[PDB]
Structures are given as structure tokens and as C-alpha cells.
Design a protein around this nucleic acid. Structure first.
Ligand SMILES: [Mn+2]
Ligand SMILES: [Mn+2]
Lengths: 29, 263
RNA sequence: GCUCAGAUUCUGCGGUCUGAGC
């Protein structure tokens, strides 16, 4: 299933989804 | 020509001199990217509703792409949709840029705000795979009409006694000539088709009746072919099919995994 | 050494640190 590795990307999803306090994805794809 | 053939095929001593190799990261890693980049191609293609064929033509562009550019300078997770895109343009089921993107995004970023179509972030994204596509083109030297092993395998299917039940276990197995093997850059579609079946029916225990009047039932799909090789390769294919760290929550199973339906 | 869960505006999808369980 997963090009979405845990985690070196599964991780950024954590960093991105937690600028969900007013900062946003610079680059998001 | 320059050349007609020598163009997109390489020696094991060449893929070692990968161009992603002249950079600071592994083979064990790279072998591992390609499979995880094609892997993405699949997911999106299924989400976009495109033939499994287009998916494969992307996977061949991708493969062929990173034999010229490092995975350091063009990240797999952004050449993937760039190519699936130009693929479904070629194999002809077009989908539109804003459509690919909107998928890729819910691929890679499951729990995000579905994209604002007007944000400078977005109008830069699309700005990019647009420039990337000009690259994925200039790179495959404009050679996008791609020949696959399935076209062949479809040829010698019931052109032998073969239970469909195990005659299309070779069709399926071809598409791994792509996902998890460097095969598509090494030997031709034919030769490569020969393998996806001589292996397919050693798990199926049905074997090939030899053709009566003095010519083997595999010498009819390609001219130079030895068991000395096909046995050699199905080794690679398998110790590569099992040089995998049990990550096979496998590729075209999302909801098409189990053998057709019971529940 | 693998591999999960918390931390890091070090940073493009890979590098740090901290706990479990095997
Ligand atoms: Mn089975
Ligand atoms: Mn104990």
C-alpha cells in the first residue's frame, strides 16, 4: 500500500498537520 | 540508430553506476524507492480511475527517468504524479492537472484541508509539474510510446493448454516486472514476458507441454532464450520478491486482493 | 541493529533527542 512510508513522510504529515495552529504547508504536495 | 535500441537498456554494471548513485545514498535504498514510487503511481491511477495500463506506462517512464537524474535532485513523490499525468495523456484517458493534484494530495496528505484552488501555494504547485513535465519529456527523449510485456504474454496464453485460473496469473505477474523489479530497464518486453510465465506456472504447478515438431514452446515468442537464463532470472525475481522486508501489504490489493469474491 | 507511539518551524518527504514492547 505505502509509498507513504512510516515515517520519514508519515512524519511530515505530523509536522504539517501540526502547524495547524496558524502556520501552513509551504510546499504541500 | 542513436540508437534504435541501445537507448533504454543497461548492464548490471551500469545500474550500479546509477546517477542517483553518484550521490550520497544506498542501492538497498534506491531499489527501495523505485518500488515505492511506482507504488504511489498505482494508488493515484486507481484513485483517478485509469486503466492499469497507463499506470504501467508511468512506471516505465519513472524507471526510465531515474536512469538519468538522481532521486536527490528530483524527488520520487513529485515526479510520480508528473508522470502519471503525462502518461494518461498518452495512453488516452486524459485527466486534468487540477484533478491529478487534488488526488496526489489526498494520497500523501490524508488528513489535510482539501487544497485551496486559488492559494499562491497551489498556483505554484501546478506551476511546477508543468515545468517538471517539460522535463520528464526532455528526458525520455520524447520516446513515450511504450511497449509492455503484457502485450506479448496475452499472445501465448491459451496458445498452450492453460487453465485461465492460472493463465492470467502471468498477466498479473507481469505488472511486477514493473513494480518491484528493475527488469524493464534490462531485457526486452518479450524476454521479460517469457519470465513472468515460466515463474507464474512454477507456483501454479502446471508446466508447458513442448511443441511437437522440434522447437520449444517458448522459442515462439522470442528468438534468443535459454532456461539457463530464465532460471537465472526467476531467481533474481524471487530473491527480490523476498528480498522484501515483508512490506507486502501488496500493490493492487486495495480492495482487489482476495481471489474473486466470497467475503 | 529492525519496528511502532511522544518531541523538533533543526528541514522538502531525511537528520537529531526521549520512553516503552519484542
Ligand atoms: Mn495465493
Ligand atoms: Mn519479565
Amino acid at each position: 500500500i505505502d509509498y507513504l512510508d512510516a515515517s520519514l513522510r508519515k512524519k511530515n504529515k505530523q509536522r504539517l498537520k501540526a502547524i495547524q495552529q496558524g502556520r501552513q504547508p509551504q510546499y504541500l504536495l | 540508430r542513436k540508437n534504435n535500441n541501445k537507448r533504454w537498456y543497461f548492464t548490471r554494471e551500469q545500474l550500479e553506476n546509477s546517477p542517483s548513485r553518484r550521490f550520497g545514498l544506498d542501492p538497498d535504498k534506491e531499489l527501495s524507492y523505485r518500488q515505492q514510487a511506482a507504488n504511489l503511481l498505482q494508488d493515484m491511477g486507481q484513485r483517478l480511475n485509469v486503466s492499469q495500463l497507463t499506470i504501467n506506462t508511468a512506471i516505465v517512464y519513472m524507471h526510465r527517468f531515474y536512469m538519468i537524474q538522481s532521486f536527490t535532485r528530483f524527488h520520487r513523490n513529485s515526479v510520480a504524479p508528473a508522470a502519471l499525468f503525462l502518461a494518461a495523456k498518452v495512453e488516452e484517458q486524459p485527466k486534468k492537472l487540477e484533478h491529478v493534484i487534488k488526488v496526489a494530495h489526498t494520497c500523501l496528505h490524508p488528513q489535510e484541508s482539501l487544497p485551496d484552488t486559488r492559494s499562491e501555494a497551489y498556483l505554484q504547485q501546478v506551476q511546477d509539474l508543468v515545468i517538471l513535465e517539460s522535463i520528464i519529456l526532455q528526458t525520455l527523449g520524447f520516446e513515450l510510446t511504450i511497449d509492455h510485456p503484457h502485450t506479448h504474454v496475452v499472445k501465448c496464453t491459451q496458445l498452450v493448454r492453460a487453465s485461465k485460473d492460472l493463465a492470467q496469473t502471468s498477466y498479473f505477474m507481469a505488472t511486477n516486472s514493473l513494480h518491484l523489479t528493475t527488469f524493464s530497464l534490462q531485457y526486452t518486453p518479450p524476454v521479460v514476458a517469457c519470465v513472468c510465465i515460466h515463474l507464474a506456472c512454477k507456483w501454479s504447478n502446471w508446466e508447458i507441454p513442448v511443441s511437437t515438431d522440434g522447437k520449444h514452446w517458448w522459442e515462439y515468442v522470442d528468438a534468443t532464450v535459454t532456461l539457463e537464463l530464465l532460471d537465472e532470472l526467476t531467481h533474481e525475481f524471487l530473491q527480490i520478491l523476498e528480498k522484501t522486508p515483508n512490506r507486502l501489504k501488496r500493490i493492487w490489493n486495495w480492495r482487489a486482493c482476495q481471489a474473486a469474491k466470497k467475503t
